[PDB]
Design a protein around this motif. Sequence first.
Motif, PDB file in Angstrom:
ATOM      1  N   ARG A   1       0.922  -1.288   0.088  1.00  0.00           N
ATOM      2  CA  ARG A   1       0.248   0.017  -0.061  1.00  0.00           C
ATOM      3  C   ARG A   1       0.865   1.371   0.020  1.00  0.00           C
ATOM      4  NH1 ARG A   1      -5.115  -1.918   3.812  1.00  0.00           N
ATOM      5  NH2 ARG A   1      -6.369  -2.714   1.808  1.00  0.00           N
ATOM      6  N   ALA A   2       0.542   2.199  -0.778  1.00  0.00           N
ATOM      7  CA  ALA A   2       1.393   3.637  -0.758  1.00  0.00           C
ATOM      8  C   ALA A   2       0.211   4.663   0.031  1.00  0.00           C
ATOM      9  CB  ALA A   2       1.344   4.066  -2.045  1.00  0.00           C
ATOM     10  N   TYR A   3       0.673   5.408   0.789  1.00  0.00           N
ATOM     11  CA  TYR A   3       0.096   6.291   1.573  1.00  0.00           C
ATOM     12  C   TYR A   3       0.397   7.910   1.333  1.00  0.00           C
ATOM     13  CZ  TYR A   3      -0.586   2.071   4.127  1.00  0.00           C
ATOM     14  OH  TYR A   3      -1.007   1.021   4.689  1.00  0.00           O
ATOM     15  N   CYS A   4      -0.689   8.603   0.931  1.00  0.00           N
ATOM     16  CA  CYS A   4      -0.457   9.958   0.549  1.00  0.00           C
ATOM     17  C   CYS A   4      -1.135  10.856   1.599  1.00  0.00           C
ATOM     18  CB  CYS A   4      -0.861  10.308  -0.733  1.00  0.00           C
ATOM     19  SG  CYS A   4      -0.473   9.097  -2.051  1.00  0.00           S
ATOM     20  N   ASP A   5      -0.811  12.035   1.550  1.00  0.00           N
ATOM     21  CA  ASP A   5      -1.378  13.535   2.285  1.00  0.00           C
ATOM     22  C   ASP A   5      -2.445  14.074   1.527  1.00  0.00           C
ATOM     23  OD1 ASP A   5       0.354  16.003   1.332  1.00  0.00           O
ATOM     24  OD2 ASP A   5       1.355  14.190   1.201  1.00  0.00           O
ATOM     25  N   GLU A   6      -3.287  14.921   1.817  1.00  0.00           N
ATOM     26  CA  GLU A   6      -4.384  15.164   0.925  1.00  0.00           C
ATOM     27  C   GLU A   6      -3.698  15.638  -0.248  1.00  0.00           C
ATOM     28  OE1 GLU A   6      -5.873  19.202   1.289  1.00  0.00           O
ATOM     29  OE2 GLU A   6      -7.081  18.521  -0.438  1.00  0.00           O
ATOM     30  N   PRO A   7      -2.982  16.524  -0.558  1.00  0.00           N
ATOM     31  CA  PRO A   7      -2.786  17.076  -1.815  1.00  0.00           C
ATOM     32  C   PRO A   7      -2.334  16.082  -2.670  1.00  0.00           C
ATOM     33  CG  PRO A   7      -1.099  17.899  -0.172  1.00  0.00           C
ATOM     34  CD  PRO A   7      -1.970  17.209   0.453  1.00  0.00           C
ATOM     35  N   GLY A   8      -1.789  14.746  -2.256  1.00  0.00           N
ATOM     36  CA  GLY A   8      -1.669  13.638  -2.957  1.00  0.00           C
ATOM     37  C   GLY A   8      -0.032  13.429  -3.049  1.00  0.00           C
TER      38      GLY A   8
ATOM     39  N   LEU B   1       1.745  -5.644   3.692  1.00  0.00           N
ATOM     40  CA  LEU B   1       1.064  -6.512   4.714  1.00  0.00           C
ATOM     41  C   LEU B   1       2.056  -7.602   5.226  1.00  0.00           C
ATOM     42  CD1 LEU B   1      -1.224  -6.979   6.648  1.00  0.00           C
ATOM     43  CD2 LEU B   1      -2.307  -8.179   4.629  1.00  0.00           C
ATOM     44  N   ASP B   2       2.368  -7.941   6.382  1.00  0.00           N
ATOM     45  CA  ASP B   2       2.920  -8.973   7.009  1.00  0.00           C
ATOM     46  C   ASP B   2       1.753 -10.058   7.563  1.00  0.00           C
ATOM     47  OD1 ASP B   2       3.639 -10.891   9.180  1.00  0.00           O
ATOM     48  OD2 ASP B   2       5.723  -9.765   9.438  1.00  0.00           O
ATOM     49  N   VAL B   3       1.610 -11.086   6.677  1.00  0.00           N
ATOM     50  CA  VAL B   3       0.386 -11.753   7.019  1.00  0.00           C
ATOM     51  C   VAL B   3       0.547 -12.715   8.114  1.00  0.00           C
ATOM     52  CG1 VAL B   3      -0.085 -12.070   4.263  1.00  0.00           C
ATOM     53  CG2 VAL B   3       1.451 -13.605   5.586  1.00  0.00           C
ATOM     54  N   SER B   4       1.622 -13.158   8.740  1.00  0.00           N
ATOM     55  CA  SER B   4       1.912 -13.496   9.853  1.00  0.00           C
ATOM     56  C   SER B   4       1.385 -12.888  11.032  1.00  0.00           C
ATOM     57  CB  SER B   4       3.217 -14.019  10.153  1.00  0.00           C
ATOM     58  OG  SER B   4       3.991 -14.664   9.070  1.00  0.00           O
ATOM     59  N   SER B   5       1.790 -11.507  11.279  1.00  0.00           N
ATOM     60  CA  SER B   5       1.446 -10.436  12.342  1.00  0.00           C
ATOM     61  C   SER B   5       0.293  -9.795  12.158  1.00  0.00           C
ATOM     62  CB  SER B   5       2.699  -9.651  12.428  1.00  0.00           C
ATOM     63  OG  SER B   5       2.572  -8.601  11.638  1.00  0.00           O
ATOM     64  N   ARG B   6      -0.333  -9.914  10.775  1.00  0.00           N
ATOM     65  CA  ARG B   6      -1.700  -8.958  10.403  1.00  0.00           C
ATOM     66  C   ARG B   6      -1.413  -7.328  10.619  1.00  0.00           C
ATOM     67  NH1 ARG B   6      -5.503 -13.543  11.126  1.00  0.00           N
ATOM     68  NH2 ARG B   6      -3.890 -14.180  12.599  1.00  0.00           N
ATOM     69  N   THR B   7      -0.008  -7.098  10.328  1.00  0.00           N
ATOM     70  CA  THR B   7       0.354  -5.721  10.403  1.00  0.00           C
ATOM     71  C   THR B   7       0.804  -5.203   9.155  1.00  0.00           C
ATOM     72  OG1 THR B   7       2.414  -6.244  11.315  1.00  0.00           O
ATOM     73  CG2 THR B   7       0.851  -6.052  12.674  1.00  0.00           C
ATOM     74  N   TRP B   8       0.532  -3.676   8.856  1.00  0.00           N
ATOM     75  CA  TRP B   8       0.985  -3.286   7.647  1.00  0.00           C
ATOM     76  C   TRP B   8       2.513  -2.457   8.147  1.00  0.00           C
ATOM     77  CZ3 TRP B   8      -0.493  -3.399   2.694  1.00  0.00           C
ATOM     78  CH2 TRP B   8      -1.808  -4.053   2.532  1.00  0.00           C
ATOM     79  N   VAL B   9       3.511  -3.036   7.763  1.00  0.00           N
ATOM     80  CA  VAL B   9       4.774  -2.802   8.092  1.00  0.00           C
ATOM     81  C   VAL B   9       5.600  -1.678   7.561  1.00  0.00           C
ATOM     82  CG1 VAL B   9       7.338  -3.645   8.410  1.00  0.00           C
ATOM     83  CG2 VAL B   9       5.159  -5.023   9.347  1.00  0.00           C
ATOM     84  N   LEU B  10       5.840  -0.899   8.006  1.00  0.00           N
ATOM     85  CA  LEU B  10       6.589   0.397   7.041  1.00  0.00           C
ATOM     86  C   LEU B  10       7.898  -0.413   6.349  1.00  0.00           C
ATOM     87  CD1 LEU B  10       6.159   3.597   7.017  1.00  0.00           C
ATOM     88  CD2 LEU B  10       8.270   3.501   8.384  1.00  0.00           C
ATOM     89  N   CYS B  11       7.580   0.226   5.069  1.00  0.00           N
ATOM     90  CA  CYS B  11       8.786  -0.097   3.959  1.00  0.00           C
ATOM     91  C   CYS B  11       9.727   0.802   4.243  1.00  0.00           C
ATOM     92  CB  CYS B  11       8.140   0.165   2.699  1.00  0.00           C
ATOM     93  SG  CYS B  11       7.029  -1.085   2.406  1.00  0.00           S
ATOM     94  N   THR B  12      10.926   0.627   4.053  1.00  0.00           N
ATOM     95  CA  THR B  12      12.383   1.463   3.922  1.00  0.00           C
ATOM     96  C   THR B  12      12.591   2.344   2.751  1.00  0.00           C
ATOM     97  OG1 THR B  12      13.323  -0.416   5.276  1.00  0.00           O
ATOM     98  CG2 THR B  12      14.734   1.364   4.483  1.00  0.00           C
TER      99      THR B  12
END
Length: 92
Positions: A61-68, A76-87
């Motif tokens: 997933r990519a995440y943007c602020d309003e202006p885009g 998604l780390d399926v084991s932990s069900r967590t969305w882990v920050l990419c480096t």
Amino acid sequence: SDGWTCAGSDFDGDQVRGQARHWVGQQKTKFSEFHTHNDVPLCYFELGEGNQLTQSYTGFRAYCDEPGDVYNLRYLDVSSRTWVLCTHYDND
């Protein structure tokens, strides 16, 4: 330029931002549970491989602020069900 490393996968900065332009312009991002370190709300889109545009879950997933502007990426780390920050990285 720049990019992100998500677990084993590389995402190119320009390709990511090209997908972001599409989904922001179409107004089809989704409200995210995350906010920036400055408390700015984020929206997300499902991140395709390369330039691929998709509304289907991909694992990334990519995440943007309003202006885009793309703020960060998660996978998604399926084991932990967590969305882990990419480096994030910047090339020379």
